Design an enzyme around this catalytic site. Structure first.
Site, PDB file in Angstrom:
ATOM      1  N   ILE A  93      19.590  44.852  22.815  1.00  0.00           N
ATOM      2  CA  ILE A  93      20.767  45.434  22.174  1.00  0.00           C
ATOM      3  C   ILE A  93      20.828  46.944  22.296  1.00  0.00           C
ATOM      4  O   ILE A  93      21.899  47.535  22.207  1.00  0.00           O
ATOM      5  CB  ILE A  93      20.936  44.989  20.712  1.00  0.00           C
ATOM      6  CG1 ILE A  93      19.722  45.348  19.864  1.00  0.00           C
ATOM      7  CG2 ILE A  93      21.184  43.503  20.664  1.00  0.00           C
ATOM      8  CD1 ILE A  93      19.765  44.714  18.477  1.00  0.00           C
ATOM      9  N   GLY A  94      19.680  47.564  22.533  1.00  0.00           N
ATOM     10  CA  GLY A  94      19.645  48.991  22.756  1.00  0.00           C
ATOM     11  C   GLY A  94      18.457  49.409  23.586  1.00  0.00           C
ATOM     12  O   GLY A  94      17.351  48.918  23.387  1.00  0.00           O
ATOM     13  N   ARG A  95      18.697  50.318  24.523  1.00  0.00           N
ATOM     14  CA  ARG A  95      17.633  50.941  25.293  1.00  0.00           C
ATOM     15  C   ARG A  95      17.584  52.419  24.924  1.00  0.00           C
ATOM     16  O   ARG A  95      18.586  53.130  25.030  1.00  0.00           O
ATOM     17  CB  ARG A  95      17.877  50.798  26.803  1.00  0.00           C
ATOM     18  CG  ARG A  95      18.365  49.422  27.267  1.00  0.00           C
ATOM     19  CD  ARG A  95      19.896  49.315  27.226  1.00  0.00           C
ATOM     20  NE  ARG A  95      20.383  48.056  27.785  1.00  0.00           N
ATOM     21  CZ  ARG A  95      20.862  47.922  29.018  1.00  0.00           C
ATOM     22  NH1 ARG A  95      20.927  48.972  29.825  1.00  0.00           N
ATOM     23  NH2 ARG A  95      21.282  46.738  29.444  1.00  0.00           N
ATOM     24  N   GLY A  96      16.422  52.882  24.480  1.00  0.00           N
ATOM     25  CA  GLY A  96      16.251  54.288  24.161  1.00  0.00           C
ATOM     26  C   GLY A  96      15.174  54.910  25.025  1.00  0.00           C
ATOM     27  O   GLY A  96      14.469  54.212  25.751  1.00  0.00           O
ATOM     28  N   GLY A 134      11.972  53.684  23.348  1.00  0.00           N
ATOM     29  CA  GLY A 134      11.803  52.252  23.161  1.00  0.00           C
ATOM     30  C   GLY A 134      13.094  51.454  23.145  1.00  0.00           C
ATOM     31  O   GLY A 134      14.179  52.021  23.061  1.00  0.00           O
ATOM     32  N   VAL A 193      15.585  48.324  21.501  1.00  0.00           N
ATOM     33  CA  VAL A 193      15.870  47.596  20.278  1.00  0.00           C
ATOM     34  C   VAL A 193      16.229  46.150  20.629  1.00  0.00           C
ATOM     35  O   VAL A 193      16.892  45.912  21.636  1.00  0.00           O
ATOM     36  CB  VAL A 193      17.007  48.274  19.492  1.00  0.00           C
ATOM     37  CG1 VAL A 193      17.230  47.580  18.172  1.00  0.00           C
ATOM     38  CG2 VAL A 193      16.671  49.738  19.274  1.00  0.00           C
ATOM     39  N   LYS A 216      12.806  47.661  16.965  1.00  0.00           N
ATOM     40  CA  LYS A 216      12.550  48.631  18.025  1.00  0.00           C
ATOM     41  C   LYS A 216      11.090  48.591  18.464  1.00  0.00           C
ATOM     42  O   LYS A 216      10.175  48.659  17.632  1.00  0.00           O
ATOM     43  CB  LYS A 216      12.901  50.049  17.585  1.00  0.00           C
ATOM     44  CG  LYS A 216      12.848  51.034  18.735  1.00  0.00           C
ATOM     45  CD  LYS A 216      13.437  52.388  18.378  1.00  0.00           C
ATOM     46  CE  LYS A 216      13.455  53.292  19.608  1.00  0.00           C
ATOM     47  NZ  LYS A 216      14.157  54.588  19.376  1.00  0.00           N
ATOM     48  N   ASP A 275      19.039  66.469  13.886  1.00  0.00           N
ATOM     49  CA  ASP A 275      19.974  65.959  14.886  1.00  0.00           C
ATOM     50  C   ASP A 275      21.076  65.135  14.236  1.00  0.00           C
ATOM     51  O   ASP A 275      21.362  64.016  14.650  1.00  0.00           O
ATOM     52  CB  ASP A 275      19.234  65.137  15.955  1.00  0.00           C
ATOM     53  CG  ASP A 275      20.089  64.849  17.182  1.00  0.00           C
ATOM     54  OD1 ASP A 275      21.160  65.471  17.368  1.00  0.00           O
ATOM     55  OD2 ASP A 275      19.678  63.981  17.977  1.00  0.00           O
ATOM     56  N   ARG A 296      26.986  60.220  16.465  1.00  0.00           N
ATOM     57  CA  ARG A 296      26.264  59.268  17.323  1.00  0.00           C
ATOM     58  C   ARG A 296      24.984  58.775  16.649  1.00  0.00           C
ATOM     59  O   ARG A 296      24.446  57.725  17.017  1.00  0.00           O
ATOM     60  CB  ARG A 296      25.926  59.891  18.683  1.00  0.00           C
ATOM     61  CG  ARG A 296      24.979  61.062  18.580  1.00  0.00           C
ATOM     62  CD  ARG A 296      24.508  61.634  19.912  1.00  0.00           C
ATOM     63  NE  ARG A 296      23.743  62.845  19.641  1.00  0.00           N
ATOM     64  CZ  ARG A 296      24.284  64.052  19.490  1.00  0.00           C
ATOM     65  NH1 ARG A 296      25.586  64.212  19.652  1.00  0.00           N
ATOM     66  NH2 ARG A 296      23.525  65.106  19.209  1.00  0.00           N
ATOM     67  N   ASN A 297      24.505  59.532  15.662  1.00  0.00           N
ATOM     68  CA  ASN A 297      23.236  59.231  14.992  1.00  0.00           C
ATOM     69  C   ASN A 297      23.371  58.671  13.579  1.00  0.00           C
ATOM     70  O   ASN A 297      22.405  58.649  12.815  1.00  0.00           O
ATOM     71  CB  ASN A 297      22.340  60.465  14.996  1.00  0.00           C
ATOM     72  CG  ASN A 297      21.823  60.795  16.382  1.00  0.00           C
ATOM     73  OD1 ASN A 297      21.544  59.896  17.169  1.00  0.00           O
ATOM     74  ND2 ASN A 297      21.701  62.078  16.690  1.00  0.00           N
ATOM     75  N   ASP A 337      18.660  57.508  12.926  1.00  0.00           N
ATOM     76  CA  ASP A 337      18.030  58.334  13.932  1.00  0.00           C
ATOM     77  C   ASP A 337      16.999  59.289  13.322  1.00  0.00           C
ATOM     78  O   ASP A 337      17.036  60.496  13.554  1.00  0.00           O
ATOM     79  CB  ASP A 337      19.088  59.118  14.714  1.00  0.00           C
ATOM     80  CG  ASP A 337      18.488  59.973  15.799  1.00  0.00           C
ATOM     81  OD1 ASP A 337      17.580  59.469  16.493  1.00  0.00           O
ATOM     82  OD2 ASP A 337      18.894  61.153  15.934  1.00  0.00           O
TER      83      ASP A 337
HETATM   84  C1  LIG Z   1      22.237  46.977  15.985  1.00  0.00           C
HETATM   85  O1  LIG Z   1      21.485  47.551  14.978  1.00  0.00           O
HETATM   86  C2  LIG Z   1      20.669  48.613  15.280  1.00  0.00           C
HETATM   87  C3  LIG Z   1      19.879  49.165  14.283  1.00  0.00           C
HETATM   88  C4  LIG Z   1      19.051  50.238  14.569  1.00  0.00           C
HETATM   89  C5  LIG Z   1      19.015  50.767  15.849  1.00  0.00           C
HETATM   90  C6  LIG Z   1      18.112  51.924  16.129  1.00  0.00           C
HETATM   91  C7  LIG Z   1      18.682  53.205  15.591  1.00  0.00           C
HETATM   92  N1  LIG Z   1      18.272  53.890  14.535  1.00  0.00           N
HETATM   93  N2  LIG Z   1      19.040  54.976  14.406  1.00  0.00           N
HETATM   94  C8  LIG Z   1      19.962  55.003  15.385  1.00  0.00           C
HETATM   95  S1  LIG Z   1      21.308  55.823  16.107  1.00  0.00           S
HETATM   96  C9  LIG Z   1      21.533  54.635  17.376  1.00  0.00           C
HETATM   97  C10 LIG Z   1      22.509  54.683  18.479  1.00  0.00           C
HETATM   98  C11 LIG Z   1      22.645  53.732  19.492  1.00  0.00           C
HETATM   99  C12 LIG Z   1      23.666  54.247  20.354  1.00  0.00           C
HETATM  100  C13 LIG Z   1      24.276  53.758  21.535  1.00  0.00           C
HETATM  101  C14 LIG Z   1      25.273  54.507  22.161  1.00  0.00           C
HETATM  102  C15 LIG Z   1      25.674  55.743  21.633  1.00  0.00           C
HETATM  103  C16 LIG Z   1      25.081  56.226  20.471  1.00  0.00           C
HETATM  104  C17 LIG Z   1      24.066  55.459  19.832  1.00  0.00           C
HETATM  105  N3  LIG Z   1      23.333  55.708  18.701  1.00  0.00           N
HETATM  106  N4  LIG Z   1      20.590  53.699  17.224  1.00  0.00           N
HETATM  107  N5  LIG Z   1      19.756  53.898  16.150  1.00  0.00           N
HETATM  108  C18 LIG Z   1      19.808  50.216  16.849  1.00  0.00           C
HETATM  109  C19 LIG Z   1      20.635  49.137  16.561  1.00  0.00           C
END
Ligand SMILES: COc1ccc(Cc2nnc3sc(-c4cc5ccccc5[nH]4)nn23)cc1
Length: 273
Positions: free
Chosen positions: A28-31, A34, A36, A50, A132, A136-137, A150
Site C-alpha cells: 500500500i505504500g513504498r517509502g 520501508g 507499508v 510498516k 516536516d 502530505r504528512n 510522519d
Molecule cells: C493506509 O494507511 C497508512 C497508515 C500509515 C502509513 C505510514 C505513514 N505514517 N505517516 C505518514 S504520511 C504518509 C504518506 C503516504 C503518501 C503517499 C503519497 C503522497 C504523500 C504521502 N504521505 N504515510 N504515512 C501509510 C498508510
C-alpha cells in the site's frame, strides 16, 4: 546484550508475533525507509504495517507509544522491525483535498486545519518538534479525522519531489515549508513548526496547490527576503489569512503558539454554517 531496563520498559508496546498477521502480498505504500502493508491485529483489527530496512533505537522509539491524541497518528505496537499503525482509509491529506471526486466545503477545509492545530498543540505540549509538517504528512481515517503523522517510527520522505539538498551539509530539506531561520541555520523549533502550519493552511485553502511554484527551491530564502509571502487563496477568509501571516512572522518568538492557533481557528470555523 540489550539493556535489561529497556527490555522491560517496552513490554507495554511490544506485539506478540502470534497476534499479528502481515499481508505482504498487498503493497500500500513504498517509502525510502520501508514499505507499508495491510495487516490484521489480534477480536480482529485492521491495520497498516510498516517494515523498516536492515535495534535499541527501534525499541526506544516507544516514546511514540506515549503519544495519544485524536488528531495524532497513534502507535498500536511494534513487533525486520515492524511498525504497527492504525489503518488510514483516506490516505494523506494533500492527495485527499486534491481529489476532484471529493467535495469538501470551505468549512470542512478549515476544520481539517483546526484538527491539525489540535494535534500539534498536543505534540508541542510534549516538547515534540515535528520538523516536516505539511499536508502530505497528515492522514485521514474512515471518519475523516485528521491525524498529524510522519513522525517517530513512521518518519519518511513520502513525496521526494519536495526535498532539496543543502550545500554545506547533506540534508534533503522541505524548503518550501521551512521558516526563514531554519533555512539559514537548519535548526528546527516549535515556532518553525508554526511557520510550516501556516503553509499547510494555505495548502488546505487552495485544495493542495504546490507553494511557490515558480521559485526554484533553495533560493526560497532570497524570495522571502524580498518582502514576500504566499498570496491569499480565493476562498480563504480574511481572518484565516491574517493567521497565516502571523505564522510567518519574521521573528520566531512573535509567531502564535499552537494553543493560540487552535483558539483563533476554532472561532473562525464557528462562523460557518
Ligand atoms: C493506509 O494507511 C497508512 C497508515 C500509515 C502509513 C505510514 C505513514 N505514517 N505517516 C505518514 S504520511 C504518509 C504518506 C503516504 C503518501 C503517499 C503519497 C503522497 C504523500 C504521502 N504521505 N504515510 N504515512 C501509510 C498508510
Amino acid at each position: 546484550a540489550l539493556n535489561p531496563e529497556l527490555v522491560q520498559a517496552v513490554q507495554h508496546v511490544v506485539i506478540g508475533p502470534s497476534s499479528l498477521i502481515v499481508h505482504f502480498n498487498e503493497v500500500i505504500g513504498r517509502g525510502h525507509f520501508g514499505c507499508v502493508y495491510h495487516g490484521t491485529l489480534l477480536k480482529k483489527i485492521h491495520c497498516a504495517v510498516k517494515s523498516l530496512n536492515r535495534s535499541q533505537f527501534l525499541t526506544e522509539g516507544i516514546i511514540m507509544k506515549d503519544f495519544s491524541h485524536p488528531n495524532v497518528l497513534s502507535l498500536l505496537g511494534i513487533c525486520s522491525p515492524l511498525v504497527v499503525l492504525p489503518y488510514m482509509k483516506h490516505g494523506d491529506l494533500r492527495n485527499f483535498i486534491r481529489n476532484e471526486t471529493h467535495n469538501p466545503t470551505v468549512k470542512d477545509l478549515i476544520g481539517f486545519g483546526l484538527q491539525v492545530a489540535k494535534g500539534m498543540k498536543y505534540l508541542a505540549s510534549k516538547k515534540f518538534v515535528h520538523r516536516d509538517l505539511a499536508a502530505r504528512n497528515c492522514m485521514l481515517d474512515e471518519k475523516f479525522t485528521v491525524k498529524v503523522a510522519d513522525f517517530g517510527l513512521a518518519r519518511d520522505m513520502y513525496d521526494k519531489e519536495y526535498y532539496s539538498v543543502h550545500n554545506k551539509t547533506g540534508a534533503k530539506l522541505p524548503v518550501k515549508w521551512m521558516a526563514l531561520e531554519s533555512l539559514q541555520t537548519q535548526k528546527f523549533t516549535t515556532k518553525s513548526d508554526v511557520w510550516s502550519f501556516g503553509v499547510l493552511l494555505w495548502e488546505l485553502m487552495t485544495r493542495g496547490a504546490p507553494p511557490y511554484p515558480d521559485v526554484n527551491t533553495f533560493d526560497i530564502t532570497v524570495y522571502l527576503l524580498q518582502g514576500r509571502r504566499l498570496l491569499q487563496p480565493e476562498y480563504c477568509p480574511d481572518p484565516l489569512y491574517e493567521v497565516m501571516l502571523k505564522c510567518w512572522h519574521p521573528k520566531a518568538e512573535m509567531r502564535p503558539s499552537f494553543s493560540e492557533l487552535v483558539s483563533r481557528i476554532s472561532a473562525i470555523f464557528s462562523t460557518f454554517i
